Amino acid sequence: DRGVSTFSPEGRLFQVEYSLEAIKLGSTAIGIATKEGVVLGVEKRATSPLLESDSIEKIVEIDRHIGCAMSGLTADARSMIEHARTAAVTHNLYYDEDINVESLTQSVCDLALRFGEGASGEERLMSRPFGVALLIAGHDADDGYQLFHAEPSGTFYRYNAKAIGSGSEGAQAELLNEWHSSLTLKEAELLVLKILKQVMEEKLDENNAQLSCITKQDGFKIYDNEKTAELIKELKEKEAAE
Amino acid sequence: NNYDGDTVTFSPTGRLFQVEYALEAIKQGSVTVGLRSNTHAVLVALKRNADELSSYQKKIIKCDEHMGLSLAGLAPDARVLSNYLRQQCNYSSLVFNRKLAVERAGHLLCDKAQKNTQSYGGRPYGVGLLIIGYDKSGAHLLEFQPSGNVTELYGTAIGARSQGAKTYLERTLDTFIKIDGNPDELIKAGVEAISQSLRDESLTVDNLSIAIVGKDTPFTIYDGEAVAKYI
Amino acid sequence: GYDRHITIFSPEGRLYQVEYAFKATNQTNINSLAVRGKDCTVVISQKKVPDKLLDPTTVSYIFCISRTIGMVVNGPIPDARNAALRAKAEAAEFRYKYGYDMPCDVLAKRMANLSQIYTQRAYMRPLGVILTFVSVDEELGPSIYKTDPAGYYVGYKATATGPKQQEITTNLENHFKKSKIDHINEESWEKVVEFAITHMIDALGTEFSKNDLEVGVATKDKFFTLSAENIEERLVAIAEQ
Amino acid sequence: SDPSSINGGIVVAMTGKDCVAIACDLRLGSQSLGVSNKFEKIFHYGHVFLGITGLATDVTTLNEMFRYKTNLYKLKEERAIEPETFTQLVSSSLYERRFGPYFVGPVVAGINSKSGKPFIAGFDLIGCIDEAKDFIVSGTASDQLFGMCESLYEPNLEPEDLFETISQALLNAADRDALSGWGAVVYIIKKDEVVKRYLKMRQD
Amino acid sequence: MTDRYSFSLTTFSPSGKLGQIDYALTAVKQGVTSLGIKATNGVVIATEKKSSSPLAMSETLSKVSLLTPDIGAVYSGMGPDYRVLVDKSRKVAHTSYKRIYGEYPPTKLLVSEVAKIMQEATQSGGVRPFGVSLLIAGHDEFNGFSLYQVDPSGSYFPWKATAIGKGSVAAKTFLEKRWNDELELEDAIHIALLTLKESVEGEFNGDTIELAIIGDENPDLLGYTGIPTDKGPRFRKLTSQEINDRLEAL
Amino acid sequence: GYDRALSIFSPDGHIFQVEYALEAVKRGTCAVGVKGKNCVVLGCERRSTLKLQDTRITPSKVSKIDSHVVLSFSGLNADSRILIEKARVEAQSHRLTLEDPVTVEYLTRYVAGVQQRYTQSGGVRPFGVSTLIAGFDPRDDEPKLYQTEPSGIYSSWSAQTIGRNSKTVREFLEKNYDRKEPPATVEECVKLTVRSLLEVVQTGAKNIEITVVKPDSDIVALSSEEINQYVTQIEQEKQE
Amino acid sequence: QFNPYGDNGGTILGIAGEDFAVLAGDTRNITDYSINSRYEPKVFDCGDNIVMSANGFAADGDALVKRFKNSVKWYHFDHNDKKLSINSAARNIQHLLYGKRF
Amino acid sequence: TGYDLSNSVFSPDGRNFQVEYAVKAVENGTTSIGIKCNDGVVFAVEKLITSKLLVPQKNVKIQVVDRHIGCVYSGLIPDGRHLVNRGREEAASFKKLYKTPIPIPAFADRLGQYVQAHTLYNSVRPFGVSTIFGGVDKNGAHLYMLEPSGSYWGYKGAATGKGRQSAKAELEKLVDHHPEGLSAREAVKQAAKIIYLAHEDNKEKDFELEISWCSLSETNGLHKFVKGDLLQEAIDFAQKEIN
Amino acid sequence: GSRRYDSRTTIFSPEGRLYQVEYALESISHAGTAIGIMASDGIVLAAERKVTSTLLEQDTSTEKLYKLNDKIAVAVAGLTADAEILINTARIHAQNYLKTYNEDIPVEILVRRLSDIKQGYTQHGGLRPFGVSFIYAGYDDRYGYQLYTSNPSGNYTGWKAISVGANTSAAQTLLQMDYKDDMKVDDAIELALKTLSKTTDSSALTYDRLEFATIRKGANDGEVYQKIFKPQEIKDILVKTGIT
């Protein structure tokens, strides 16, 4: 609507608020973070049998130990992904050191939150305004596994589990009690599938759901799809036992 | 009405409606109190989380060895200003063998702000910083306003429920100024100042994070056990 | 609707910004009378009474641009001060190029072009002032050129700017038509000034004093503005005649 | 020294009456190595003939350029370039690159459309109008032809008496110069007919 | 009109006919009468001086401003605009044609240049077109004597007989019936005066009527004897007395 | 704007420039892409019933990008022109620099990126073009079929239709083309493609263009006699 | 002729132990056959238990060292108070040097 | 109309609306005054102590520019500080090119052009301040105040900020007492009475008196502040007469 | 709030197809009719001059007939002023190709370029689509005679035969009847002059209000020779049809 200068009588920019509305529209992405690894799951989404589910991807490795999921406006995200990759490889050159997942996010936010129709201190190559969320996950040595929520309104928040998209409203409440410090790997896998099932109409099956993980030892690893299939099957056995 | 869609037309009021709206993000900001003695200067700030599971995110940024700030209002506008205070400190030291003065900082910050509301477009600002620093004349507290008005005070509060902190500073001026060479009694004093703004909240190590710079102390952000004694 | 107000073309054929500009001129309530003398060119203009403004000797309105060239303003002071600077920049440019200061007509012509440009510029508005350039050129002699907001200039045997300009225009007209010469025949610059004072007094139907007039005289080789007391000396001689 | 002396080669033009001759050698060699016995040097854009000496790359790039500029002209003006106009254009264009100069010696030749006069002109490296009606001579053997033509010169010749003169001059000068040899081509322009003549020469 | 697509001129007006151009036409019209007659061995162009104070030296207003010493132009419309256009037009004339062919432009070529400028000056969302229409009269031997009209849209066309200004209706009709190209330049000078009376007579001294001819070469304005090839300015300016004399030889 | 702020982000959060771009495409012609298990067939509606044109000289909607890549489009023809050239530049850039053939996948990104970048740039708009990008990557017997949209993203499809009557045309494909059985033979694939087109084009040899691409850089345009062969065989089955 | 790049001698010695590291330098700074200063330091601590000395031309020394200190200061700043390791410092210096190989 | 929507548009009123609104802004901020002495200049300013928290005598309006030009402003505070900083740049360049600390009538001239430029340009909004400035240079004592019209004049006395009605009324007397003005020392005492009389329109919060001067005789041709005892003696006189 | 689509064609139309493009079609229709007939034996381009009356010397006028190349020429209809800028752009690009490859630029390539420029105006900023439509007559060596017309939109299409601007419909339907793939040059010239007469209210349709040209391969050795028919040769063609 209104200018980059224009501030609301609420206090917050107009642009920023309109941007929040989009995220709901975008894909359901849920993470649970644990100290043996972060587990990420996304509905890849089928809408026609013609559409080739397998070809498209929603989780993309930016680094050999950092992966990213996108929810929101998928047009904007092409840039985001390309900036990210660039940033990570700049540090790897300069310092030859673990890609802090914290430092990678900080680079990202300079690029994202710098819209303006003309600035005189800063290069304007943006007009409007990068309204996209990313859940930025990985391991960095010093501080172990991290998971951030990248926010178009301002400073990123660290999370221990977070749920975004269409299914956020139901999921997020669930995540308050069920997130605990006794989720091992095995549990974390199962739990994400569980929530994802209840809150989305789209039937959980591997042709439209996919899992991913970060183990420092093997790096960011996108799972083969056979693996995924076995897990969906164990889940069903436990839901039908109770 | 057209004067809050512009920033190039004087309002009838005499000062842009846009600059007043901007102020309101500040009050939506975290309640932060700032106060000083001649010797030391302390900021006490509330960190805010966005979920129970979410960890608290630091609302005090370290600018330099001998400086830092606490912010209330817009985050985007903040990134630019945090870098500019580092650019200033780094220049003064390298070039002139002299760390930056808080007196100087505020004035250069006024001008830059004012130039960006005057011009078409650009970036007006919507963040208040309470900047502490240790200079030649000891520790000081400056109040930065996005409007571009700088005043050195011995105490202020920005954010919400500023009434209770305001009463605290107004009372304890005469008692705290006199208290000097004591970083500790003065830090304690700030935790008591913030107690009044808060209603129906725990005062805990997690909530509060306290910064100090003065004659004795370099800039240090205290968390955990470091604030546990003074609560 | 929107374009009429701003400086881009109107359906009319004549921009409203030019009309508005002339209205602004008469707010200041500043008369002028300018004549061609034999060796001189005489300009007089209404001096605002100094409240405490500047020196009370000369509350400046006639500005020596250069040797010979002088300039009187009728209309807004902010635009006056702007105008004066632009004129000084132009005179240096020309001087470097050709070795001489601008002749009076050329300089009026230079300013014309710049006002007009300014209206084609959407964001920029043109001048608000009326500038009467006066000089004694070496090769063109006595010279008067009045340049308007419009971007239009023309030369003058004599001229008046202000709200009561017409009363001065009538008086001069009959005199120069009778006399059949477009200058004051007097060789002595003193006598030219003395003639001009008399006509001014009569035309507007009011006496004058030193603090009510500012006089610039242009002769060969120089421009100079008379002392407060020099204007009074001339005034006295007429007075006791 | 100059790159124009490394490939050699000559152009010569003479006046007749209401007729012109313009001729060259078809030798292009690069020092020892004779490369072509058929490399043309005289080119035409309509009736204004453009003879070009010197540096070989420079010849081709400029012929294409001057093609470029007179093509713009013919459509704009809606009429054939004139000999006169062309002369002035050529000079200006050689001064454009004063530094990094052109290493050529062009000769303009023509018969004026409206005035009917035979016209010739010469240019230096960075271009100037050189009027001299009798001949304009160029190339490494420029001195040879200066003297040779002036002794033989007799004014405003008929087409047939002119042909003989330019033939005799080109022929002896060439054989007295290393870099000029192999074949020749002569354009005798009668008034606007062009008879185009390859001369026989004892090739070595 | 005064459309939302006319607040900025970069954009196309709903009617397929630009706003601004119609506004320019109005300006020309309100302008004072000028007229142009193309003859076998000439062009006579004629105008009235704009009315001003008699104190004002209207000598200084020269309606007829040369583009080049052998080619002149006359206008109707906004005077300010006219002086500015004329300065540009003069510069481009020399730069593009005298530095690479060493000579004045042909009438046709120079005309083309002015016409382009005006288009460019409506495309931008800033610049507005000049308030005038030109008549451009010149001579060359390649394409004869010539007279054109250039419009403020940016397009040019040749005219046997043309008129601009407010009196243009009166003048065109008259020209058509009283004159044919067969008549000489000389004849035309009388005719042109008589058409300028139709508009509004009054005072008809050459102090307020401005007449120029483009014709035979002026040996006097060559200014130097030189080579016999050179020709003086085809253009010749009349003095007020000669203008006065054709009233006594009308 | 003199002081009009032209900024746009919409109170619904998705710019209006992207929204209106989708309408522009629909109006334009229908193009269909259906891949067998060994060929990719691109069927596109030509306007050819129209008065006096010569079809040869009229620039064909299929445009050769490369020696294994084609591009067809729906929408405005004007908008489409600039893209052809940009895409052509990229095909030899990729080969220059990585020194490998064009990947059908790589190239799609470049095409996408133009429209996309222009969402997030002042003074420029998303192009009003939807496209089908198909070919056979060298040294593979895999057929490759994508559809890209004005927003500046892509997806891969067993079969998809763009431009006018998108729902109606896709309905026939759902029932008569399957992911479970894509046409084994090329000839059969041409046949079902043609069958969809009759719905929206109703015969006319010129009016139907079918371009088949077979493995390993063999791009061939279907013979006017074969287009006709197919039509006839269908019209008999309707009697039954 | 402005002599492109000077000289100032001195000699540095770095020895890597196995729980310690010593870097030694003499205090004698010379130009030609004058002693500019009999006592002058030139081994500087840039923080994080890293010492640097850039021996040869003193101007080239001084300027490099400063830009190195700045780099350490702003790394911590930007990386929320985290140690700069010795290998990342080495790499970084390499780039400064390569940048001023031209 | 297009006058409300945009700055720097000819209106029939002769002035764009934006100029009128600006004038109101100027008044906001406390009284500043100037008094031209027979030797110098005296600048005298009311500094409102807003609160106890607000520190005494450190948040001073007066800024020193060159060594001989005292600058003070009332109006939009951020506009005026930003202005002093711009004028410094103008001042520095002058001293490189010409190797002289900038004279006052020259200094006025430069600043004036800048304000004027913004009242022709829509894209850059004008200033909203009246700057009283001057000092002692080669061409002697000088005193200019610069209106946001962009016009400037010299003045024997001048006044800005809310108390301006009172300050002008008083000034007429200093002229009856001496038409060349009071000797610098004397002038300061009488200046102090003017500040207090302007404090009745600014009696909401208390104040602290600050006066500065540039004067040849006793200030050394350079601008320095009245401090200490000389200040205190002024403080007592004003209190004694307002009673 | 609002303050959009008041300066730039960057902002998309509610409609989805630019409003600005449509206004351009209208300009072209106030202009006269131009006629292209494509034939293997040659091309004819004949158009009625917009210009009128004897007061304007129309014989002199050249305002719709331009050669780009010695093979390629245009019949231009729509705004005269906009056209002038575009004629010069074409000459510069064409003549640069001629330098680079020393080969006549192919007709299809030339037209493609100019269409990219038209497109540029709308895609970027708020510049107007130039409200001019051209008919290009051209001979490429491969495809023989080629006829194109280009829209103000930024696209070109080839045409066996075309009519544009004013009275589009009337002209086309007559042209359809008498259409031949084996159309003689002779026959093509005549056909146009009858068509022009029926679309104009002038039955005689003077020579001096007629512009005619013919791109002929009837000329020597099958070579393309462009022959602008002077107004006096149009005049003879009037008498032949006996409409004079």
* Contact list, G81 vs chain B (CB under 8 Å): 62
Measure CB to CB from residue B52 to each of A10, A110, A176 and give the nearest one: A176
CB B70, CB B210: distance < 8 Å: no
Measure CB to CB from residue B9 to each of H53, H58, H125 and give the nearest one: H125
Best of A25, A78, A111 to substitute, by most chain F Cβ atoms within 10 angstroms, is A78
Rounded to an integer, what distance in angstroms lies between the CA atom of residue D119 and that of residue G62?
A: 74
Give the sheet arrangement for strand C62-64, strand by strand: C62-64, C70-74, C130-137, C141-147, C153-156, E56-57
At least 3 CB pairs under 8 A between chains H and E? no
Which residue, B103, B129, B133, is CA-closest to B41?
B133
CB H155, CB H34: distance < 8 Å: yes
Q: What's the one-letter identity of residue I234?
A: I
Burial classification of residue F160, based on how many CB atoms lie within 10 Å of its CB (0-12 exposed, 13-18 middle, 19 or more buried): buried
Which residue, H151, H7, H148, is CA-closest to H74?
H148
Give the list of residues 6+ apart from residue A241 with CB closer than 8 angstroms, or none. Answer: none
Which residue, H127, H118, H136, is CA-closest to H221?
H136
80-109 in chain C: CB under 8 A from chain E: 105, 109
Question: What tokens does B120 get?
Answer: 């078409």
Contact G74 B94 (CB under 8 A): no
Question: What tokens does H181 get?
Answer: 């003005």
> Residue C32 CB: number of other CB atoms within 10 A?
24
Pairing of strands E156-158, I65-67: unpaired
Which residue, I130, I24, I76, is CA-closest to E17?
I24
Q: Chains near D, with 3+ CB pairs < 8 A?
A: E, I
Q: Which helix (H) or strand (E) holds B64?
A: strand B60-64
Quote the minimal CA–CA distance from B2 to chain F in Å: 10
> Breaks in chain D follow which residues, C to N over 2.5 Å?
none
Q: Strand ranges (DSSP E) for chain I?
A: 34-38, 42-48, 65-67, 73-78, 132-139, 145-150, 156-158, 161-164, 210-216, 225-229
Rounded to an integer, what distance in angstroms lies between the CA atom of residue I237 and that of residue C142?
A: 69
Question: What tokens does E152 get?
Answer: 């403020």
**Three-state SS for G52?**
strand
Give the sheet arrangement for strand I156-158, strand by strand: I65-67, I73-78, I132-139, I145-150, I156-158
The tally of CA atoms less than 13 A away on the side-chain side of residue C138 is 6
Cα–chain center distance at A220: 14
The DSSP result for A137-150, as a single string, is EEEETTTEEEEEEE
Q: For residue B7, what is the nearest residue in chain F, using CA coordinates?
A: F3
Contact B153 H54 (CB under 8 A): yes
Give the list of residues 6+ apart from residue B206 with CB closer than 8 angstroms, or none. Answer: B47, B56
Rounded to an integer, what distance in angstroms lies between the CA atom of residue C137 and that of residue C132?
A: 15
Contact G74 B64 (CB under 8 A): no
**Three-state SS for D72?**
helix
Question: What tokens does D149 get?
Answer: 């033509």
Best of C8, C123, C129 to substitute, by most chain H Cβ atoms within 10 angstroms, is C123
CB I110, CB I150: distance < 8 Å: no
Rounded to an integer, what distance in angstroms lies between the CA atom of residue C42 and that of residue B7?
A: 48
**Three-state SS for D43?**
strand
Q: For residue F3, what is the nearest residue in chain C, using CA coordinates?
A: C123
Q: For residue I9, what is the nearest residue in chain E, using CA coordinates?
A: E11
Q: For residue I139, what is the nearest residue in chain F, using CA coordinates?
A: F57
Which residue, B70, B75, B78, is CA-closest to B42?
B70
User: What is the number of domains present in chain F?
Assistant: 1
Distances (CA, A) of B46 to B33, B60, B142, B190, C121: 9, 9, 19, 12, 53
Domain that holds residue F240: 1-240
The DSSP result for D94-114, as a single string, is HHHSTTTT--EEEEEEEE-TT
Which residue, A167, A159, A112, is CA-closest to A136?
A159
Full 3-state SS string of A161-181: EEEECCCHHHHHHHHHHHCCC
CB B92, CB B67: distance < 8 Å: no
E107 in reach of chain I (CB within 8 A): no
Question: What tokens does D25 get?
Answer: 């050698």
Rounded to an integer, what distance in angstroms lies between the CA atom of residue E125 and that of residue E138?
A: 33
List phi, psi (to 5°) of A115: -85, 165
**Three-state SS for B208?**
strand
CB F161, CB F30: distance < 8 Å: yes
Beta-bridged to residue G35, according to DSSP, are G30
Quote the minimal CA–CA distance from H94 to chain C in Å: 17
Q: For residue E109, what is the nearest residue in chain D, using CA coordinates?
A: D77
- In chain G, DSSP finds a helix count (H) and a strand count (E) of 2, 6
Q: Domain map of chain I by residue range?
A: 1-244
The tally of CA atoms less than 13 A away on the side-chain side of residue B174 is 4
Rounded to an integer, what distance in angstroms lies between the CA atom of residue A105 and that of residue A111?
A: 10
In which residue are the tokens 């496209």 written? F131
Burial classification of residue G6, based on how many CB atoms lie within 10 Å of its CB (0-12 exposed, 13-18 middle, 19 or more buried): exposed
Give the list of residues 6+ apart from residue F23 with CB closer than 8 angstroms, or none. Answer: I15, I16, I17
Best of E142, E143, E229, E230 to substitute, by most chain D Cβ atoms within 10 angstroms, is E142
H93 in reach of chain C (CB within 8 A): no
Question: What tokens does F223 get?
Answer: 């013979």
Question: What tokens does I156 get?
Answer: 């070109």
Beta-bridged to residue I160, according to DSSP, are none
Rounded to an integer, what distance in angstroms lies between the CA atom of residue D127 and that of residue A208?
A: 77
C224 in reach of chain E (CB within 8 A): no
> Residue B153 CB: number of other CB atoms within 10 A?
21
Angle (CA) F219-F223-F229 rounded to 5° is: 130
Contact F5 B8 (CB under 8 A): no
Give the list of residues 6+ apart from residue H203 with CB closer than 8 angstroms, or none. Answer: none
CB B186, CB B40: distance < 8 Å: yes
Q: Chains near E, with 3+ CB pairs < 8 A?
A: C, D, I
Contact I91 D72 (CB under 8 A): yes
> Breaks in chain G follow which residues, C to N over 2.5 Å?
none
Quote the minimal CA–CA distance from F177 to chain I in Å: 32
Which residue, I207, E27, H73, A230, is CA-closest to C18?
E27
Rounded to an integer, what distance in angstroms lies between the CA atom of residue G53 and that of residue B106?
A: 37
Best of A45, A51, A71 to substitute, by most chain F Cβ atoms within 10 angstroms, is A51
Question: What tokens does E239 get?
Answer: 């003095």
Give the list of residues 6+ apart from residue D5 with CB closer than 8 angstroms, or none. Answer: D140
Which residue, E6, E12, F24, is CA-closest to I19?
E12
Rounded to an integer, what distance in angstroms lies between the CA atom of residue I97 and that of residue I114?
A: 14
Measure CB to CB from residue C82 to each of H3, H116, H152 and give the nearest one: H116
Would you call H30 a catalytic residue per the annotation? yes
Fold category of I1-244 in CATH: Glutamine Phosphoribosylpyrophosphate, subunit 1, domain 1 (3.60.20)
Rounded to an integer, what distance in angstroms lies between the CA atom of residue B30 and that of residue B130?
A: 12
Rounded to an integer, what distance in angstroms lies between the CA atom of residue I198 and that of residue I177?
A: 15
Contact B121 A10 (CB under 8 A): no
Given resolution (angstroms): 7.7
At least 3 CB pairs under 8 A between chains I and E? yes
Measure CB to CB from residue A5 to each of B7, B23, B51 and give the nearest one: B7
Q: Please state the CATH superfamily assignment of the domain spanning residues H1-243 in this structure.
A: Aminohydrolase, N-terminal nucleophile (Ntn) domain (3.60.20.10)
- The alpha-helical segments, DSSP class H, found in chain D are 4-7, 56-77, 83-96, 142-152, 159-175
Terminal-residue alpha carbon distance, chain F: 66
G94 in reach of chain A (CB within 8 A): no
Domain that holds residue B64: 1-231
- The dihedral built from the CA positions of residue B199, B201, B204 and B207, taken in this order, carries a sign that is negative
Which residue, B70, B133, B66, B77, is CA-closest to B105?
B133
F59 in reach of chain I (CB within 8 A): yes
In which residue are the tokens 């208040």 written? B128
Contact E154 I81 (CB under 8 A): yes
Give the list of residues 6+ apart from residue I138 with CB closer than 8 angstroms, or none. Answer: I71, I72, I107, I110, I111, I145, I146, I147, I148
Rounded to an integer, what distance in angstroms lies between the CA atom of residue E162 and that of residue E157?
A: 11
Rounded to an integer, what distance in angstroms lies between the CA atom of residue H35 and that of residue H167?
A: 11
Distances (CA, A) of A154 to A106, A110, A132, C228, I52: 11, 10, 12, 68, 68
190-219 in chain E: CB under 8 A from chain I: none
Give the list of residues 6+ apart from residue E82 with CB closer than 8 angstroms, or none. Answer: E65, E75, E130, E131, E132
> Breaks in chain F follow which residues, C to N over 2.5 Å?
none
The tally of CA atoms less than 13 A away on the side-chain side of residue H164 is 15
Measure CB to CB from residue B53 to each of A109, A153, A161 and give the nearest one: A161
Contact B122 A10 (CB under 8 A): no
CB C234, CB C241: distance < 8 Å: no
Quote the minimal CA–CA distance from D122 to chain E in Å: 16
Measure CB to CB from residue D88 to each of E102, E109, E141 and give the nearest one: E102
Q: Chains near F, with 3+ CB pairs < 8 A?
A: A, B, C, H, I
Of residues H1, H30, H31, H160, which has the active-site annotation? Answer: H30
Give the list of residues 6+ apart from residue B228 with CB closer than 8 angstroms, or none. Answer: B205
Beta-bridged to residue H152, according to DSSP, are H146
Q: Does domain C1-241 have CATH number 3.40.190.80?
A: no
Q: Chains near H, with 3+ CB pairs < 8 A?
A: B, C, F
Rounded to an integer, what distance in angstroms lies between the CA atom of residue F185 and that of residue A23?
A: 44
Burial classification of residue F23, based on how many CB atoms lie within 10 Å of its CB (0-12 exposed, 13-18 middle, 19 or more buried): middle
Rounded to an integer, what distance in angstroms lies between the CA atom of residue D83 and that of residue D90?
A: 11
In which residue are the tokens 């940024």 written? B61
Angle (CA) I152-I156-I160 rounded to 5° is: 125
Contact F116 A74 (CB under 8 A): no
User: What is the number of domains present in chain B?
Assistant: 1
Rounded to an integer, what distance in angstroms lies between the CA atom of residue A77 and that of residue A79?
A: 5
Q: What is the CATH number of the domain that holds F221?
A: 3.60.20.10
Measure CB to CB from residue B57 to each of A4, A114, A155 and give the nearest one: A155
Burial classification of residue G100, based on how many CB atoms lie within 10 Å of its CB (0-12 exposed, 13-18 middle, 19 or more buried): exposed
The tally of CA atoms less than 13 A away on the side-chain side of residue G73 is 18
106-125 in chain H: CB under 8 A from chain C: 112-113, 115-117, 119-123
List phi, psi (to 5°) of H94: -65, -45
Rounded to an integer, what distance in angstroms lies between the CA atom of residue F51 and that of residue I149?
A: 14
Rounded to an integer, what distance in angstroms lies between the CA atom of residue E215 and that of residue H62?
A: 75
Distances (CA, A) of E236 to E146, E212, E217, E226, I232: 16, 6, 8, 20, 35
> Residue D57 CB: number of other CB atoms within 10 A?
11
Helix H77-98 vs helix H104-118: crossing angle, to nearest 10: 130
* Contact list, B90 vs chain G (CB under 8 Å): 70, 73-74
G86 in reach of chain A (CB within 8 A): no
List phi, psi (to 5°) of A158: -75, 145
H7 in reach of chain C (CB within 8 A): no
G78 in reach of chain A (CB within 8 A): yes
The DSSP result for E67-100, as a single string, is EETTEEEEEEE-HHHHHHHHHHHHHHHHHTTTSS
Q: Does domain E1-249 have CATH number 3.60.20.10?
A: yes
For D135, which DSSP code?
A: E
Backbone Cα Rg of chain B: 18
Q: What's the one-letter identity of residue F234?
A: I
Which residue, H99, H85, H50, H91, is CA-closest to H68?
H91
Burial classification of residue A66, based on how many CB atoms lie within 10 Å of its CB (0-12 exposed, 13-18 middle, 19 or more buried): buried
F5 in reach of chain B (CB within 8 A): yes
For D176, which DSSP code?
A: T
Q: Chains near C, with 3+ CB pairs < 8 A?
A: E, F, H
Q: What's the one-letter identity of residue A50?
A: L
Q: Which helix (H) or strand (E) holds F211?
A: strand F208-214
Rounded to an integer, what distance in angstroms lies between the CA atom of residue B204 and that of residue D33?
A: 96
Distances (CA, A) of D64 to B151, D127, I101, I159: 73, 18, 11, 35
> Residue H157 CB: number of other CB atoms within 10 A?
23
Give the list of residues 6+ apart from residue D61 with CB closer than 8 angstroms, or none. Answer: none
For C101, which DSSP code?
A: P
* Contact list, A114 vs chain F (CB under 8 Å): none
Give the list of residues 6+ apart from residue A177 with CB closer than 8 angstroms, or none. Answer: none
In which residue are the tokens 């870098």 written? B83
Experimental method: cryo-EM
Fold category of A1-242 in CATH: Glutamine Phosphoribosylpyrophosphate, subunit 1, domain 1 (3.60.20)
Contact H128 B155 (CB under 8 A): no
Rounded to an integer, what distance in angstroms lies between the CA atom of residue H61 and that of residue H83?
A: 13
